[PDB]
């Protein structure tokens, strides 16, 4: 099974550095190019540099932005990647994605990890106040329902949220992270039959890698 | 540095529209040797990421929809879907590989369909809120279009705005509608000196509100 997986990702100050990993399975790592792309939130991608293959001398390019700055490298024994980020800024904060690569006179490839996001800044780590959200003991109309969870007052992003461990998709809204001072918040709403909800158990799991934190909270009624 | 033009930056069409967008190369992409122009495209729905559907500019990826068709030798390519799906909605770019990497700006497309006025639901601040004298009141506005509304809160049926955030989910993949969430945030003592607590939403689709509330001592 063809997979990428970058970690290493966070909370790093200005001037700092920080080094990103990409596991990798499911393929001859050794003949493969391997690039890193970064993009800042709401923004285009932006192509950083690959580290050819043994084929070719495991030699690496870079672009422009990154000239001097940042060094990939590949544990070959390990089979992982690395991007070491130095002299970081503001300017660096966005999601990092480490991708196979080639040579278009190949024909396959098309792989790209979930992708690690990396926030420079000064702020302090925080992790989230998780609260339930239950309908009030007001007369609630539907045969459906809808529940909620704050996740409030958190830092850096991100945080991921999901309902009885992602046994709850269908009917899952997660409204995006908003900034207030140096905290951010969300909040996710879950709508399910009135016949499932309270007779049977609605989890809100959210965890919030930068802090190391995981919170389970149940929604129950009144 | 091969710099890459996509142009329009956005579009919109409704379900089953035909829709194209162009990248544009500063240099040949077309290998000799090969005969391949080193041109792909590229897909990234909303939080997801980026997928390859297209190589070598026409060249569609295995289990790619018949819908996403490449053209285009040498500068100038055009990736074409025939008939938009809801589905669809993403931002698209392209990025060549003839010399080292690069990715065009992208285009972002947008679905439009009929109006649709939300669900609204409210929310009191939970008990374990309140214990660290904070209160926030949560209103969930779900599944509307446009995209475009409103939400006014009221205390005690007096309008409120400071302490306000919003924030909206992206288009939605299977009904083309957006939600939203309003969270209104006091502090306990504040919270406990009033009453009625409000959330109302105007929307295109009315010119009356879509009022949802609640008393802090109801039953
Ligand atoms: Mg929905
Ligand atoms: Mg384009
Ligand atoms: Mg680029
Ligand atoms: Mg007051």
């Known amino acids: 099974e063809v997979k990428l997986v970058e970690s290493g990702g966070g909370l790093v100050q200005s001037g700092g550095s920080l080094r990103l990993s990409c596991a990798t399975s499911?393929?001859?790592?050794?003949?493969?190019?391997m690039s890193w792309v970064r993009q800042p939130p709401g923004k285009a991608l932006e192509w950083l540099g690959f580290?050819?293959?043994?084929?070719?001398?495991?030699?690496?390019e870079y672009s422009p932005s990154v000239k001097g700055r940042f060094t990939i490298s590949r544990d070959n024994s390990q089979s992982i990647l690395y991007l070491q980020m130095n002299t970081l800024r503001a300017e660096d904060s966005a999601t990092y994605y480490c991708?196979?690569?080639?040579?278009?006179?190949?024909?396959?490839?098309?792989?790209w990890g979930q992708g690690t996001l990396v926030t420079v800044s000064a702020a302090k780590t925080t992790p989230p106040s998780v609260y339930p959200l239950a309908p009030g003991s007001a007369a609630q109309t539907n045969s459906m329902v809808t529940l909620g969870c704050l996740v409030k007052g958190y830092f850096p992003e991100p945080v991921t949220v999901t309902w009885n461990s992602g046994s709850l998709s269908s009917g899952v809204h997660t409204f995006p992270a908003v900034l207030q001072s140096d905290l951010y918040t969300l909040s996710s709403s879950v709508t399910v039959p009135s016949s499932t909800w309270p007779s049977e158990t609605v989890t809100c799991n959210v965890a919030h890698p930068a802090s190391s934190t995981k919170v389970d909270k149940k929604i129950v009624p009144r | 540095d091969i710099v890459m033009s996509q142009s329009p930056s956005s579009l919109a069409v409704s379900a089953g529209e035909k829709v194209t967008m162009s990248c544009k190369s500063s240099?040949?992409?077309?290998?000799?040797?090969?005969?391949?122009?080193?041109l792909a495209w590229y897909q990234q729905k909303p939080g997801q990421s980026p997928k390859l559907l297209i190589y070598?500019?026409?060249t569609r990826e295995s289990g790619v929809p018949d819908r996403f068709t490449g053209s285009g030798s040498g500068t100038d390519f055009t990736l074409t879907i025939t008939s938009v799906q809801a589905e669809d909605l993403a931002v698209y770019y392209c990025?060549?590989?003839?010399?080292?990497?690069?990715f065009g700006g992208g285009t972002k497309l947008e679905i439009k369909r009929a109006d649709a006025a939300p669900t609204v639901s409210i929310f009191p601040p939970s008990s374990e809120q309140l214990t660290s004298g904070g209160a926030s009141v949560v209103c969930f506005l779900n599944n509307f279009y446009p995209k475009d509304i409103n939400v006014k809160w009221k205390i005690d049926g007096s309008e409120r705005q400071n302490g306000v955030l919003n924030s909206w989910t992206d288009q939605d993949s299977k009904d083309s509608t957006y939600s939203m969430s309003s969270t209104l945030t006091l502090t306990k003592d504040e919270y406990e000196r009033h009453n009625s607590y409000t959330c109302e939403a105007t929307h295109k689709t009315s010119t009356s509100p879509i009022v949802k509330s609640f008393n802090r001592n109801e039953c």
């Open positions: 991708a196979r690569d080639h040579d278009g006179y190949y024909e396959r490839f098309s792989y």
């Open positions: 499911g393929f001859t790592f050794t003949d493969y190019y």
């Open positions: 580290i050819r293959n043994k084929a070719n001398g495991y030699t690496t």
């Open positions: 240099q040949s992409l077309l290998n000799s040797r090969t005969r391949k122009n080193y």
């Open positions: 070598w500019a026409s």
């Open positions: 990025k060549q590989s003839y010399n080292l990497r690069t």
